[PDB]
Amino acid sequence: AGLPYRIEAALHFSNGGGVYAGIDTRTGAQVVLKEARPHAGLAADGADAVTRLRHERDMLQRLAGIDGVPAVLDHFTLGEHHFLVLERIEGRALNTFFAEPDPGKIADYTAWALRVHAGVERLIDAIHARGIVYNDLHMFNIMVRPDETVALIDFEAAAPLAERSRQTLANPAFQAPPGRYGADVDRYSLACLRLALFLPLTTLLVQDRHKAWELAEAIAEHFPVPRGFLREAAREITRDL
Amino acid sequence: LPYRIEAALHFSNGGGVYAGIDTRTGAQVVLKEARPHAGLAADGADAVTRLRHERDMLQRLAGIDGVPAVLDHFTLGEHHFLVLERIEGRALNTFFAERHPLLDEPDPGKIADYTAWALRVHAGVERLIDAIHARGIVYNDLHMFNIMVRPDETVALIDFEAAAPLAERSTLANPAFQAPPGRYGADVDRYSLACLRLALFLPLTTLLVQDRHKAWELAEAIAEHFPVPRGFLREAAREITRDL
Ligand SMILES: [Mg+2]
Ligand SMILES: [Mg+2]
Ligand SMILES: [Mg+2]
Ligand SMILES: [Mg+2]
Ligand SMILES: [Mg+2]
Ligand SMILES: [Mg+2]
């Protein structure tokens, strides 16, 4: 083999790109391995797995040193098979918390959720300081570590802040806003996350972006959130509606 | 809504997947969601487009055991929802972390128990794939992440976005080996099944590092550790390298 890594689990695979959990045999350290195979011909399927893997590695290298961004440990190619070795971030993805009344526990949850958004906002701001927009911020990309700190997992969608593209990625909770660019895309996603951290999954999917103000008011009646916090999110969500 | 969402499974290309329950019957369901203009790919297919194509494929394959049934689909404003039956069981890729490394000086009884299990599983996938081809559909994306092993040991496939009519002439890469150049029709899925025959017995590290030129060597190495009928492995090595 000639490989210092041993793959122990297969996590997911899509569009010719696989993600695996492994071990550096030289040190026993836990790693994540992302692999990609080239795809030739037809530009209408745009960008193969190797192109997207190279872009993710570039974004991760521009964001190096930021806590909450996985470090690039290694990268190599076996023929045309590209390998990307990342650090393994421990913890749970934020979407797995939505699957699982005591007034003490309501208040304990409210503080917990605000600390998560606040850590995500601080992480997102550090990323903007490097000149990068994250673009794909939502509950499936947010990792909650055991010490309650946060991290982001997939950086394929990130792009330089300079790059002014009207293309804007849609949120699981609300429709994507039309003409936002730069850090305003991440500004919009963070606003949606402030509502989403308190809405039930069923309500999250059904309710449209026009009902944001009503949703903020409903949250403020059930949770001890400072009321302006929720209203600013509803304002940011409806700034163009 | 007659459905209550209990878990958020994944989100990609503007489309979310959720596990839920029909409140009228308590049945376990899967809910896939899409909003227009979301997930806009370079071919112009947005998330609603892929959801409609997946529903079409699942409706062409209705009644086939191993293909999830379409339970419901509706639109709230412009919000498209697709309700599918929940396939019980485990994804085949989750066995490579437990029903694999323990077979390093291995128990020969457990080696044989895994070998029989793997050949049963692979045979069920072939039977399902044949039913799908008889229905006029190519699956295109057959690999260990799309295969469900149900509690009674029968198999199923989960994701049908990549499926297409046998006619559609215009190949997706496999997790173990590169996709072959000029294959079309049912030969695409025939190649995926060949790769699956090796992948069920190779360790994950060897699977990813070794290329399809080494198929014959891999088949020989499998036969030294596992009591696999050698013709099973030889047909896979031939199908994988038939164009080299
Ligand atoms: Mg909306
Ligand atoms: Mg909604
Ligand atoms: Mg379910
Ligand atoms: Mg069906
Ligand atoms: Mg390989
Ligand atoms: Mg190959």
Cα–Cα distance for residue pair B92/B147, rounded to 1 Å: 6
Contact yes or no for A234/A215 (Cβ under 8 A): yes
Contact yes or no for B71/B83 (Cβ under 8 A): yes
Give the one of A3, A45, A95 whose C-beta lies nearest to B205's C-beta.
A3
Q: Which of B152, A19, A234 is nearest to A8 (CA)?
A: A19
Cα–Cα distance for residue pair B75/B114, rounded to 1 Å: 45
Any bridge partners for residue A5, and if so which?
A: A24
**Nearest chain A residue to B79, by CA:** A206
Q: What CATH fold (topology level) applies to the domain A92-237?
A: Transferase(Phosphotransferase); domain 1 (1.10.510)
Q: Which of A93, A73, A71, A76 is nearest to A12 (CA)?
A: A93
Q: Which residues contact B122 (CB under 8 A, 6 or more apart)?
A: B193, B196, B197, B200
Query: What would the two tokens of residue B37 be?
Result: 């203009």
Q: Which of A88, A92, A169, A174 is nearest to A135 (CA)?
A: A169
Edge-to-edge, what's the strand order for the sheet holding B70-76? Answer: B3-12, B15-22, B28-34, B79-85, B70-76
Could you write out the three-class secondary structure of chain A? Answer: CCCCEEEEEEEEEECCEEEEEEEECCCCCEEEEEEECCCCCCHHHCCCHHHHHHHHHHHHHHCCCCCCCCCEEEEEEECCEEEEEEECCCCEEHHHHHHCCCHHHHHHHHHHHHHHHHHHHHHHHHHHHCCEECCCCCCCCEEECCCCCEEECCCCCCEECCCCCCCCCCCCCCCCCCCCCCHHHHHHHHHHHHHHCCCCHHHHHHCCHHHHHHHHHHHHHHCCCCHHHHHHHHHHHCCCC
Cα–Cα distance for residue pair A109/A101, rounded to 1 Å: 12
Q: Cβ atoms within 10 A of the Cβ of B62, count? A: 11
b/e B130-153 (16+ beta carbons within 10 angstroms → b): ebbbebebbbbbbbbbbbbbeeee
* Helices A227-237/A183-196 angle, 10° precision: 130
Beta strand A30-36 pairing with A159-160: unpaired
A201–B6 C-beta distance less than 8 A? yes
Query: What would the two tokens of residue A175 be?
Result: 């429709």
Q: Which residues contact A149 (CB under 8 A, 6 or more apart)?
A: A67, A68, A119
Query: What would the two tokens of residue B105 be?
Result: 């000086």
- Smallest CA–CA distance, residue A151 to chain B, in Å, is 17
Breaks (C-N over 2.5 A) in chain B follow: 104, 170
Contact yes or no for B84/B69 (Cβ under 8 A): yes
Q: Cα B151–B161–A99 angle (5° rounding)?
A: 55
Query: What would the two tokens of residue A88 be?
Result: 């393994």
Contact yes or no for B95/B149 (Cβ under 8 A): yes
Contact residues, chain B, for A8 at CB < 8 Å: 97, 101, 204
CB-count exposure of residue B188 (10 Å: 0-12, 13-18, 19+): buried
A140–B11 C-beta distance less than 8 A? yes
**Nearest chain B residue to A77, by CA:** B209
Cα–Cα distance for residue pair A51/A38, rounded to 1 Å: 8
Q: Which residue has the tokens 């940011």?
A: A236
A10–B37 C-beta distance less than 8 A? no
Cα–Cα distance for residue pair B236/B222, rounded to 1 Å: 12
Give the one of A1, A79, A170 whose C-beta lies nearest to B211's C-beta.
A79
A149 residue type, one letter? T
A205 is in an annotated binding site: yes
Cα B200 to Cα A2, B35, B43: the distances in Å are: 22, 38, 34
Q: Which of B120, B59, B112, B111 is nearest to B84 (CA)?
A: B59
Terminal CA-CA length for chain B: 55
Cα–Cα distance for residue pair A17/A28, rounded to 1 Å: 25
A204 is in an annotated binding site: yes
Cα–Cα distance for residue pair A219/A216, rounded to 1 Å: 5
A96: Cα separation from own chain's centroid: 14
Q: Which of A22, A118, A137, A141 is nearest to B10 (CA)?
A: A141
A43–B42 C-beta distance less than 8 A? yes
Backbone angles phi, psi at B63, to 5 degrees: 90, -15
Query: What would the two tokens of residue A37 be?
Result: 């195979």
Write down the CATH number for the domain with range B90-241.
Answer: 1.10.510.10
Q: A40-43: long-range contacts (C-beta < 8 A, 24 or more apart)?
A: A42/B170, A43/B42
- B141 a catalytic residue: yes
Give the one of B42, B79, B143 whose C-beta lies nearest to A13's C-beta.
B143
Could you write out the three-class secondary structure of B145-172? Answer: CCEEECCCCCEEECCCCCCEECCCCCCC
Best of A34, A152, A168, A201 to disrupt the B interface by mutation (most B CBs within 10 Å)? A201
A189 residue type, one letter? S
Classify the phi-psi angles of B131: left when phi > 0, otherwise alpha if psi is within -120 to 50, otherwise beta: alpha
- Smallest CA–CA distance, residue A58 to chain B, in Å, is 21
Q: Which of B183, B93, B5 is nearest to A14 (CA)?
A: B93
Q: Which residue has the tokens 């199923």?
A: B156
Contact yes or no for A136/A193 (Cβ under 8 A): no
Breaks (C-N over 2.5 A) in chain A follow: 100
Cα–Cα distance for residue pair A167/A146, rounded to 1 Å: 35
Cα–Cα distance for residue pair B132/B157, rounded to 1 Å: 11
Residue B35 half-sphere exposure toward CB, CA atoms < 13 A: 20
Contact residues, chain B, for A98 at CB < 8 Å: 7-8
CATH class for the region spanning B3-85:
alpha beta
Residues B56, B65, B141, B243: which is the catalytic one? B141
Cα–Cα distance for residue pair B207/B175, rounded to 1 Å: 8
Q: Cβ atoms within 10 A of the Cβ of A48, count? A: 18
Cα–Cα distance for residue pair A72/A65, rounded to 1 Å: 10
Q: From ligand 6's centre to the CA of B155, what distance in Å?
A: 26
- The ligand that comes nearest to the alpha carbon of residue A210 is 1
- Smallest CA–CA distance, residue A214 to chain B, in Å, is 18
B108: Cα separation from own chain's centroid: 29
Contact yes or no for B95/B103 (Cβ under 8 A): no
Q: From ligand 5's centre to the CA of B175, what distance in Å?
A: 7
Residues A136, A147, A186, A208: which is the catalytic one? A136
Q: Cβ atoms within 10 A of the Cβ of B186, count? A: 17
B176 is in an annotated binding site: yes
A16–B172 C-beta distance less than 8 A? yes
Q: Where are the domains of chain B?
A: 3-85, 90-241
B40–A167 C-beta distance less than 8 A? yes
Cα–Cα distance for residue pair A28/A11, rounded to 1 Å: 19
Concatenate the DSSP letters of all residues of chain B into one string: --EEEEEEEEEETTEEEEEEEETTT--EEEEEEE-TTTT--TTS--HHHHHHHHHHHHHHTTT-TTS--EEEEEEETTEEEEEEEPPPSEEGGGGGGTTTTT-----HHHHHHHHHHHHHHHHHHHHHHHHHHHTTEE----STTSEEE-TTS-EEE---TT-EESS----PPPSSSPPPTT--TTHHHHHHHHHHHHHTTS-HHHHHHS-GGGHHHHHHHHHHHS---HHHHHHHHHHHHTT-
CATH 1.20.120.330 fits A5-87, yes or no: no
